Design a protein around this motif. Structure first.
Motif, PDB file in Angstrom:
ATOM      1  N   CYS F  35      36.464  37.445  37.579  1.00  0.00           N
ATOM      2  CA  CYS F  35      35.579  38.450  38.156  1.00  0.00           C
ATOM      3  C   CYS F  35      36.266  39.126  39.331  1.00  0.00           C
ATOM      4  O   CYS F  35      36.638  38.446  40.293  1.00  0.00           O
ATOM      5  CB  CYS F  35      34.275  37.817  38.609  1.00  0.00           C
ATOM      6  N   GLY F  37      35.129  41.123  41.623  1.00  0.00           N
ATOM      7  CA  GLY F  37      34.332  41.165  42.832  1.00  0.00           C
ATOM      8  C   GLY F  37      34.513  39.919  43.671  1.00  0.00           C
ATOM      9  O   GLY F  37      35.108  39.978  44.749  1.00  0.00           O
ATOM     10  N   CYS F  38      34.026  38.785  43.188  1.00  0.00           N
ATOM     11  CA  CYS F  38      34.344  37.494  43.778  1.00  0.00           C
ATOM     12  C   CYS F  38      35.258  36.772  42.806  1.00  0.00           C
ATOM     13  O   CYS F  38      34.890  36.558  41.648  1.00  0.00           O
ATOM     14  CB  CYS F  38      33.091  36.671  44.060  1.00  0.00           C
ATOM     15  N   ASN F  40      36.317  34.467  40.977  1.00  0.00           N
ATOM     16  CA  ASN F  40      36.058  33.249  40.234  1.00  0.00           C
ATOM     17  C   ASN F  40      36.276  33.533  38.754  1.00  0.00           C
ATOM     18  O   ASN F  40      36.578  34.657  38.355  1.00  0.00           O
ATOM     19  CB  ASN F  40      34.650  32.720  40.515  1.00  0.00           C
ATOM     20  N   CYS F  54      28.546  38.155  35.928  1.00  0.00           N
ATOM     21  CA  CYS F  54      29.064  37.057  36.726  1.00  0.00           C
ATOM     22  C   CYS F  54      27.949  36.405  37.531  1.00  0.00           C
ATOM     23  O   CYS F  54      26.981  37.052  37.931  1.00  0.00           O
ATOM     24  CB  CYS F  54      30.162  37.552  37.661  1.00  0.00           C
ATOM     25  N   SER F  56      28.372  34.792  40.499  1.00  0.00           N
ATOM     26  CA  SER F  56      28.548  35.043  41.926  1.00  0.00           C
ATOM     27  C   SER F  56      28.073  36.441  42.299  1.00  0.00           C
ATOM     28  O   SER F  56      27.110  36.607  43.056  1.00  0.00           O
ATOM     29  CB  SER F  56      30.017  34.868  42.301  1.00  0.00           C
TER      30      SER F  56
HETATM   31 ZN    ZN Z   1      32.887  37.643  41.633  1.00  0.00          ZN
END
Ligand code: ZN
Lengths: 165, 22, 147, 645, 64, 80, 134, 127
Positions: F35, F37-38, F40, F54, F56
């Motif tokens: 992901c 964005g964050c 993970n 996602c 998160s």
């Molecule tokens: Zn993310």
RNA sequence: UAGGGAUCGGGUGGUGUUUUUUUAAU
RNA sequence: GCCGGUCCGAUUUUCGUGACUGGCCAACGGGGCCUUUCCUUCUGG
């Protein structure tokens, strides 16, 4: 130490010592092996000279033995060398138990074909054949696998990999 | 995302309970 | 050959040796015509195996794309053989480099049921599963003629 | 026949009686049917009646198993132990050696020619095997010359038949007969069959077959028991033939017996060195039981009985030295037994014992102790065998060469010059003083932090078990008892010191606190009960009873129940700590109930103490009930079912 | 049987902690060999490879 | 044209349909995506059938399509 | 006709790149069930949320028996409910405008295909009989 | 349809065409033991039961020797004193060919049926 | 009885031009 | 079947035999035991 204590002996206490020595080498097993649970381990002589130790798992915890298979096999393979360690579950039936101990005998996964061919004399011959994964490691312990599966159910099963070998 | 207002036993029990109450 | 290849001599009722790769049946065999202690065979794993009785062991194994029916050594080269398989072309292998079939005789329509070298060492007789036999020369790769 | 084919068929399952036990039948039957006049002939005759027609290898091998059952039955039998039926063994030897223009015809399939024009020879081979196994079972009774001098022409005839199963029996029979002595006829027969087995090694392209192996055993017998050996070059050839077969299995006992035979019989050959190298690597690295043992036997026999030079005598020794570091548990055991044989039967011992003790100390510091105990036993044998100089260099190495150095010195002093041992014991007492000081206090602080090293400690406990120096060490051991294995060793040492040599009240308080906060726990309970029975005597007894009350996990509870049943003026100097047994009036619960019933099996004061304990429990229950009724929780009293399920 | 691990790899270090000629005896006992055999099919594959090498070396006599 | 009806060439089995071979099986792989964005990781099917999100930061990972779903242009993937 | 279907592989175990427990999948599927989602949607959202193949492989049994075990059973099965929903939707559209003779044909076909499955469900007796589509 | 009849029709018309290796998709243990006893009689070569879990497929490496196999769809009881009538009505001769019957061991032919002295119902003939 | 080419709808892979780029789409 | 040993005689090692002993190895069979874990559902009172 952490085995069932109904009938202990020296080699299973040695491999439990290998477990807690991996616990002494602490920073990777973050309480994940604290839910370990044995039932019995047993050495079995094979035709390759060496021996295979079958460790049993009561199977709510075969999915607990999840990512720890590879690391603990390469730990006890340098610790207690030149053996072959295989985990197994246990319990109209018992053919399901046979191919389930086959499917957890090879690996967590990766059987892809059962073939059986019938010669003109009358001799059946039953091959199981893996898919393609980690062949440069699994080629070493292929005779021990068919040896202990024949010892554990009497069916004559020959192992194969779809490659040149 | 696309839940149903029906088709589950406990949800149709809740619906008939709301119809019994008011 | 049978379930696995066995080696007898005529002073024993029991097999003197057992010489397989794995538990796989073997369709046909052939010895040499010189350097007699080695031999070749073909099994229904679509496989050509060689063996050497001086080491008393199998020695190499190739796998083709279809099952080899009948193998036949050359009685003048002693390290070349022909190989007749179910795809409609008799391959002609050199032994000490089994990566390349150094000839392929490519004129049939059905399974190539048998081949043999003439003892003059350059002609191939073959006989197909379709109702025809052909004679090849070694040095060409197509049919000389057909009966 | 039909019942046998239905039994050996696959598609008939659901019975316990169709597993059939078919050959203990005759194994028990010829223990009684051995009249050996007619009924044994009626055993043999329908075998021939079924054998004349046709057979497979299936029915052939089960028939040979049946006749094996007959033969073990005759050996188990005791009706023919004296020459009455050797007539019948001789008997079995003597019985082995235009017109159709009007004729109508159906049944177009012809007769297969294969029926008996061999298979008479199959009959001849198999009851030749039967009768020669009969003679090899009557070797158990007697070996008479004039009763089988008339047999030996049939024996050489059946040897020169070469139909495998008769050769397997006749080579065994000549192995047994090579101890005896017939005439020049036997000299010719023995040299002839030695040439025969050399011929079958020459033609059989493997020595890992049963015929070639048993023939190698016969060559061993021919080497061992004759006046005339033969053909140095041919035995060199047969040994060069057996040499590359040593790796792969089904070769083991018979060929290794042949190896041991000729290496005992002392002949010098250039190929014995090569088979010695391969059998040394086999002895270290083999994976089957007793094969490493017999290879160790033949390698030790070569290494002692034969004559090498300085290079081989150095390189094989260092091969053993670093073969000690082999990763297995049993190949290490076999090389330990090899060093044990070298030790038991020296100038080579004087040259090798220093590095041998060093390497066995490294093997003691190696893996899980089934090799380390054997290393300790071998080092004990070496240190006992050392005269002066090896022990001097060993004491120097133990006194010079951290925690491993201290443990090695402690174990060396535990094994084995008493004045040099006293100087080493002074160094060990300095080490034990610097070691057993406040480490036990920090360990007790760790136990208190739980329920709010140890290598040098176990080494000092072993050294105190080995050895007012005893008084200062007893004070240090009381400090050390003051992690669980360290406390166990300290409790054993404290019991031994209190046996050998208030202060005893403080030792009892430390022992009670150690048992409070398994087999050594039982021994510590025994030592504390002995100290209390040997016993501010009344104050110490009252403190002991209060400590037993505060004690009464499962092991210490069973030890507390055993100590209470062993401790309890019948009740005047006893009525102090029966309240815990009254409170004790799932396997730990079963053991505690059994010990409570045993203590209740073991008068007016007993009723008084029971009434006092029941009244105290009733007052506690009343106080708890009043606290609940005045503070009225249900979640904490009901969530145990959700926690258990 | 008293098995404390001690984390030590001190064979040569335990040899090299004293006066002269003890290191001479320690060098006099020094081979460091004899590893573990491979499994059966891998040992078979390697020695039949060696058999192939000597069989090609044999028929290279007929090569001329 | 003329092949053994037992185990054929691996190129031929990857050529033909996933149902018409000897032992039928999948040709969709599971792949793990990072992901953006964050940072993970999460698992996602190849033929994803749904816009997976996602846990998160539920931005987007793959808009579904008929066959394989298009990964959304910032995501970094690996087959597994 | 044509073939277009899944090809469930030859293995019958969790595919060993799985890095997640077994009862967590059970908690996930009872969470989506208490959200109120149909079993086939649980199956696809479990194929894509966390990398399971399907629940008969990763858990001990299928989602229908595991939801009956966790107490979130459906009173009517999936295909029955979905054919009933399609039938009432096309009935509502035809009663909006009765001229749709193709919708009349398709309503007759959906009525036939739902009475076939109702016959199967009554003859296997997993819904209470007297149930005959209102 | 009848899986045994369609399997034997598959190898029959593939032999009539003149192929060598015949795939045979719907398999069962009745077909397994059927063409097991026909390969005991050497009427085909070897074969193979590739095991996938749904039905298992069959591939037969038949050489040339069949000319007609088949079944009889009413599998009726046939007495021992009637298999001679059935051989005379099904085959072109007495010993040329066979007819295999389902019996109390199960996939015997009529020679082995008269040898073992049992019988049962007729499931197929092969010659 | 079998083989081949083309087309329509869907999917997979390739890697050139049409395309274009931080607005979405594909 | 392998090996060690008490012996007699030769030996101050090692062998012949007769006894006899145990440490172990495979093949036979006999008696049990674990694979009905410890916990819920019958046709009728
Ligand atoms: Zn993310």
């Amino acid at each position: 130490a952490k085995i069932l204590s109904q009938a202990p002996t020296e080699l299973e206490l040695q491999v439990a010592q290998a477990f807690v020595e991996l616990e002494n080498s602490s920073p990777e097993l973050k309480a994940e092996l604290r839910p370990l649970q044995f039932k019995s381990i047993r050495e079995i002589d094979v035709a390759g000279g060496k021996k295979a130790l079958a460790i049993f798992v009561p199977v709510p915890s075969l999915a607990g033995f999840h990512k720890v298979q590879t690391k603990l096999t390469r730990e006890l393979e340098k610790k207690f060398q030149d053996r072959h360690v295989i985990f197994l579950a246990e319990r109209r039936t018992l053919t399901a138990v046979h191919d389930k101990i086959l499917e957890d005998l090879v690996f967590p996964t990766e059987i892809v074909g059962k073939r059986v061919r019938y010669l003109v004399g009358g001799n059946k011959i039953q091959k199981v054949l893996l898919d393609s994964k980690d062949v440069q490691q699994i080629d070493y312990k292929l005779e021990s696998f068919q040896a202990v599966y024949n010892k554990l159910t009497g069916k004559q099963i020959v192992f194969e990999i779809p490659s040149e070998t | 995302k696309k839940a149903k207002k029906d088709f589950y036993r406990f949800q149709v029990r809740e619906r008939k309970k709301q119809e019994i109450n008011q | 050959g049978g379930a696995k290849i066995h080696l007898w001599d005529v002073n024993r009722l029991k097999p003197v040796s057992d010489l397989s790769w794995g538990a796989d049946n073997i369709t046909s065999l052939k010895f040499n015509q010189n350097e007699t202690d080695i031999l070749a065979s073909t099994g229904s794993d679509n496989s050509i195996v060689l063996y050497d009785l001086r080491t008393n062991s199998p020695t190499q194994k190739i796998v083709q794309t279809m099952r080899t029916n009948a193998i036949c050594w050359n009685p003048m080269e002693a390290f070349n053989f022909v190989t007749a398989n179910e795809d409609h072309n008799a391959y002609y292998y050199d032994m000490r480099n089994l990566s390349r079939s150094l000839n392929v005789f490519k004129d049939h329509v059905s399974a190539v049921m048998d081949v043999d070298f003439s003892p003059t060492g350059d002609e191939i007789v073959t006989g197909s599963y379709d109702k025809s036999i052909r004679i090849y020369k070694t040095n060409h790769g197509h049919s000389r003629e057909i009966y | 026949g039909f019942a046998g084919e239905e039994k050996d068929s696959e598609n008939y399952h659901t019975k316990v009686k169709e597993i059939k036990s078919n050959k203990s039948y005759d194994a028990g039957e010829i223990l009684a049917s051995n009249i050996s006049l007619t009924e044994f002939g009626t055993l043999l005759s329908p075998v021939k009646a079924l054998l004349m027609v046709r057979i497979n290898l299936r029915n052939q091998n089960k028939l040979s198993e049946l006749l094996r059952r007959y033969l073990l039955g005759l050996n188990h039998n005791s009706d023919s132990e004296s020459e009455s039926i050797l007539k019948f063994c001789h008997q079995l030897f003597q019985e082995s050696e235009k017109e159709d223009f009007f004729l109508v015809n159906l049944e177009s399939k012809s007769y297969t020619i294969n029926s008996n024009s061999l298979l008479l020879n199959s009959t001849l081979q198999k009851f030749a095997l039967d009768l020669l196994r009969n003679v090899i079972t009557r070797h158990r009774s007697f070996l008479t010359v004039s009763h089988l001098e008339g047999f030996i022409p049939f024996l050489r005839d059946s040897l020169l038949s070469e139909n495998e199963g008769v050769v397997i029996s006749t080579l065994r029979i000549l192995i047994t007969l090579i101890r005896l002595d017939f005439s020049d006829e036997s000299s010719e027969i023995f040299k002839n069959c030695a040439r025969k087995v050399l011929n079958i090694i020459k033609v059989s392209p493997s020595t890992s077959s049963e015929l070639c192996q048993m023939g190698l055993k016969f060559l061993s017998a021919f080497i061992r028991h004759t006046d005339s050996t033969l053909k140095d070059t041919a035995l060199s050839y047969v040994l060069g033939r057996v040499l590359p077969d040593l790796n792969e299995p089904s070769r083991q006992g018979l060929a290794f017996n042949f190896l041991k035979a000729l290496v005992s019989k002392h002949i010098m050959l250039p190929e014995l060195y090569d088979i010695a190298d391969t059998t040394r690597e086999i002895m270290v690295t083999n994976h089957s039981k007793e094969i490493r043992d017999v290879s160790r036997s033949v390698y030790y026999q070569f290494l002692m009985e034969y004559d090498q030079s300085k290079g081989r005598l150095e390189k094989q020794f260092k091969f053993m030295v670093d073969n000690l570091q082999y990763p297995t548990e049993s190949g290490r055991q076999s090389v330990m037994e090899l060093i044990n044989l070298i030790i038991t039967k020296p100038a080579l011992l004087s040259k090798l014992s220093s590095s041998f003790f060093l390497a066995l100390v490294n093997v003691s510091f190696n893996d899980d102790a089934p090799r380390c105990r054997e290393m300790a036993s071998v080092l004990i044998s070496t240190m006992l065998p050392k005269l002066e100089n090896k022990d001097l260099e060993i004491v120097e190495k133990y006194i010079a060469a951290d925690n491993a150095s201290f443990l090695n010195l402690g174990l060396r002093t535990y094994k084995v010059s008493i004045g040099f041992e006293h100087t080493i014991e002074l160094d060990e007492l300095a080490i034990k003083r610097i070691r057993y000081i406040l480490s036990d206090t920090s360990v007790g602080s760790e136990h208190q932090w739980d329920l709010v090293f140890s290598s040098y400690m176990e080494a000092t406990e072993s050294v105190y078990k080995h050895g007012w120096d005893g008084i200062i060490t007893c004070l240090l051991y009381p400090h050390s008892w003051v992690a669980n294995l360290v406390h166990q060793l300290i409790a054993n040492k404290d019991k031994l010191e209190i046996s050998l040599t208030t202060i005893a009240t403080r030792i009892l308080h430390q022992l009670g606190a150690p048992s409070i906060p398994a087999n050594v726990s039982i021994k510590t309970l025994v030592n504390i009960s002995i100290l209390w029975k040997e016993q501010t005597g009344e104050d110490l007894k009252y403190t002991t009873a209060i400590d037993y009350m505060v004690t009464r996990g499962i092991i210490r509870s069973d030890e507390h129940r055993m100590d209470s049943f062993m401790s309890k003026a019948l009740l005047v100097q006893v009525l102090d700590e029966d309240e815990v047994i009254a409170e004790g009036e799932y396997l730990e619960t079963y053991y505690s109930r059994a010990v409570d019933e045993e203590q209740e099996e073991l008068l007016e004061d007993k009723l008084q103490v029971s009434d006092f304990t029941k009244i105290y429990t009733a007052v506690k229950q009343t106080v708890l009930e009043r606290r609940k009724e005045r503070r009225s929780a249900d979640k904490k009293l009901r969530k145990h079912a959700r926690s258990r399920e | 049987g008293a098995s404390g691990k001690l984390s030590l790899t001190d064979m040569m270090n335990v040899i090299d902690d004293r006066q002269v000629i003890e290191n001479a005896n320690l060098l006099k006992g020094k081979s460091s060999t004899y590893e573990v055999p491979l499994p059966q099919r891998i040992q078979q594959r390697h020695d039949r490879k060696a058999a192939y090498e000597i069989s090609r070396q044999e028929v290279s006599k007929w090569n001329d | 044209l003329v092949q053994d009806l037992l185990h054929p060439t691996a190129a031929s089995e990857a050529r033909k349909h996933k149902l018409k071979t000897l032992v039928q099986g999948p040709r969709s792989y599971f792949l793990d995506v990072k992901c953006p964005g964050c940072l993970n990781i999460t698992t996602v099917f190849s033929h994803a059938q749904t816009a997976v999100t996602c846990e998160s930061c539920s931005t987007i990972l793959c808009t579904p399509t008929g066959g394989k779903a298009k990964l959304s242009e910032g995501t970094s993937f690996r087959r597994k | 006709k044509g073939i277009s279907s899944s090809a469930i592989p030859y293995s019958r175990n969790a595919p060993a790149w799985f890095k997640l427990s077994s009862e967590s999948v059970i908690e996930q599927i009872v969470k989506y069930a208490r959200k109120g989602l149909t079993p086939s949607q649980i199956g696809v959202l479990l194929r894509d949320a966390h990398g399971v193949t399907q629940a008969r492989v990763i858990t001990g049994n299928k989602i229908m028996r595991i939801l009956k075990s966790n107490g979130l059973a459906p009173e009517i099965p999936e295909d029955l409910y979905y054919l009933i929903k399609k039938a009432v939707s096309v009935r509502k559209h035809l009663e909006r405008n009765r001229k749709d003779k193709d919708a009349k044909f398709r309503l007759i076909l959906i009525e036939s295909r739902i009475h076939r499955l109702a016959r199967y469900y009554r003859t296997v007796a997993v819904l209470p009989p007297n149930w005959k589509y209102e | 349809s009848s899986v045994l009849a369609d399997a034997l029709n598959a190898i029959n018309n593939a032999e009539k065409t003149g192929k060598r290796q015949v795939l045979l998709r719907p398999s069962s243990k009745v077909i397994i033991k059927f063409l097991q006893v026909m390969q005991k009689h050497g009427y085909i070569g070897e074969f193979e039961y590739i095991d996938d879990h749904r039905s298992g497929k069959i591939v037969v490496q038949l050489n040339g020797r069949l000319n007609k196999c088949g079944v009889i769809s009413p599998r009726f009881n046939v007495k021992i004193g009637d298999i001679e009538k059935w051989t005379a009505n099904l085959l072109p001769a007495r010993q040329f060919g066979y007819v295999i019957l389902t019996t109390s061991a199960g996939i015997m032919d009529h020679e082995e049926a008269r040898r073992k002295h049992v019988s049962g119902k007729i499931l197929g003939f092969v010659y």
